[PDB]
Structure 1
């Protein structure tokens, strides 16, 4: 129930330690063995999954962090302690981009795994390691190689198998007033929403029907009361995608003759991402007549050019959604990921 956000942070990989050059007196002993050991290997920033949070402000509040430099070698052949690896917790579904090779090292799907984004450097070599008789005086110093300069660009994509997008006040936010437990601030006035809402559906024994929401817009690059354009970002990861159509508005846009435009904003972004499956399910039938409804549904579905099976339920009153629940659940069990 709070405003979405995303940003990027500046993280510098830990650089390796430096070799140590040291000579020592002992009591009345002028000349002794070379003193000074290795340095400290640089830190390794890690990415931990976050299931028990959804916040991203911890990236604007703290933008620059430095992994501790590997401590220089000390006397008495004391090597430098490895810099502690700082773990940056990240919410699930954050694809990472780099300045340069703008390809993702790996998408974050499960909870409880760690991914390396910047390996630490290499420790230096002290003069003790360089003991020899060719020089007969080990005093040269070998500095540690700096860690890799990786810059992270973070965008969040929510994990949900089913997502809601549709016309204003058409029931996209009302869809969660179903058997789901989430209750976003939904009504019957323009756009009903600013923040995406997520809800779960318990069916039977580990079968899940997490529902995603996005606030759509009008005719693409247009808006009614300042609603943003870049809200398709949280979508585009749903294996099953549903769409709602405004039915008999008091003064709103006409029937499916306007839905020819609705085809466009799916492919507007780049390509609709290989034309993910789309089912045209209707809503708000409780205030209409079913005997009046079949002639519209026979006309709405076919005027656009869609001939597949159309689902006709009233999500406003939360009745008849069960057959969708079984059928969609049937889709996953009959079509796993491959």
Structure 2
């Protein structure tokens, strides 16, 4: 049966801090009688931690920043003054992220709940100052090196945003235009004719997954099991975008097309049909600006659609970034609960 999965992947480098070094010193004070060793120990190096964050949706930021370095521990000083510990680094990933050690290929951990932490690079240990060698010792040790590790990060992706619409509305054009990356498909016998998913990156820590719903529900290569598995994680889907070709040359009338799409949606699933749904009119580049607005207002009027709708050209980019920021806003404002 149906096993297709979409997997987000990133490879990053994590480097913990080295230990600070030990110090060699002695108290040589005029009436305070002895030689007295007094060199302090170094500080331990800083650690690298991964932390699960339920507000992140994808691993997209780790395609761009790929290297993380915690701080070296401080050297020891006189008066048995032990060096300050090096500062830690925490790297945030979505809930569901599996963390693999790419050197050894072993799974280090799975980030299954909010605020959960995983140590991925242990900092070096402090050097010892001469005070530790006592029986007037002139020896000290250096701090040990911080772990250096390449991590493979893997995350099964579920749709945050669904596209709806007729064939040739511009759904895959839209998806490809907004996508910073295409996730890899796993457990699917074929390699062609995959439904369209994309990861949208708006800015740091601000991303979402967009999917073409008809590709998923039509059991095109995987059969009817795929749409059921889509429905299984529907709670991750915050909003649907009903994409409408504003002037179909195919002669078709946008109002009736819109009605067929709605009706098919309601038949398939009542939860899917009650999701927030926004009208988005596409291919406005073909028309003059004011004419597009008329045509759109008229279609909205005829559907009894009272909400705000959008006008865009998925081809040229007109209105697309504004739409994506409104989707990002909605997402940030409606976390899954």
The 8 Å contact of residues 246 and 296 in structure 2, kept in 1 or not, is answered as no
1:23 aligned to 2:26? yes
Q: TM-score, normalised by structure 2?
A: 0.47
State the match for 1:260 in structure 2: 259
Report Cα offsets for 1:180-224 as digits up to 9, x if no partner.
999999999999999999999999999999997679699999999
Report Cα offsets for 1:149-189 as digits up to 9, x if no partner.
21122233225799999997799999999999999999999
The 8 Å contact of residues 71 and 80 in structure 1, kept in 2 or not, is answered as yes
SS of equivalent to 1:230:
helix
Distance 1:220 1:15, change over 3 A: farther
Distance 1:75 1:303, change over 3 A: same
Deviation of residue 46 (structure 1)? 1.1
State the match for 2:152 in structure 1: 153
Distance 1:63 1:79, change over 3 A: same
Deviation of residue 69 (structure 1)? 0.8
The 8 Å contact of residues 185 and 193 in structure 1, kept in 2 or not, is answered as no
Distance 1:39 1:229, change over 3 A: farther
Q: TM-score, normalised by structure 1?
A: 0.47
Higher relative contact order (CA 8 A, sep 6+): 2
Report Cα offsets for 1:121-169 as digits up to 9, x if no partner.
22111100111xxxxx311121222122211222332257999999977
How many angstroms apart in 2 are the aligned matches of 1:53 and 1:208?
8
Deviation of residue 227 (structure 1)? 19
| RMSD of aligned residue pairs (Cα, Å) | 11.6
Distance 1:309 1:95, change over 3 A: farther
* Structure 2 unaligned regions, length at least 5: none
Greater helix share, 1 or 2? 2
How many angstroms apart in 2 are the aligned matches of 1:16 and 1:178?
47
How many angstroms apart in 2 are the aligned matches of 1:270 and 1:146?
57
SS of equivalent to 2:163:
strand
Distance 1:31 1:170, change over 3 A: same
How many angstroms apart in 2 are the aligned matches of 1:114 and 1:187?
27
How many angstroms apart in 2 are the aligned matches of 1:183 and 1:245?
24
* Structure 1 unaligned regions, length at least 5: 132-136
Distance 1:185 1:290, change over 3 A: farther
The 8 Å contact of residues 169 and 191 in structure 1, kept in 2 or not, is answered as no
Distance 1:251 1:48, change over 3 A: same
Deviation of residue 15 (structure 1)? 1.8
Distance 1:95 1:315, change over 3 A: same
SS of equivalent to 2:226:
coil
Distance 1:109 1:69, change over 3 A: same
Deviation of residue 119 (structure 1)? 1.6
SS of equivalent to 1:291:
helix
How many angstroms apart in 1 are the aligned matches of 2:286 and 2:190?
20
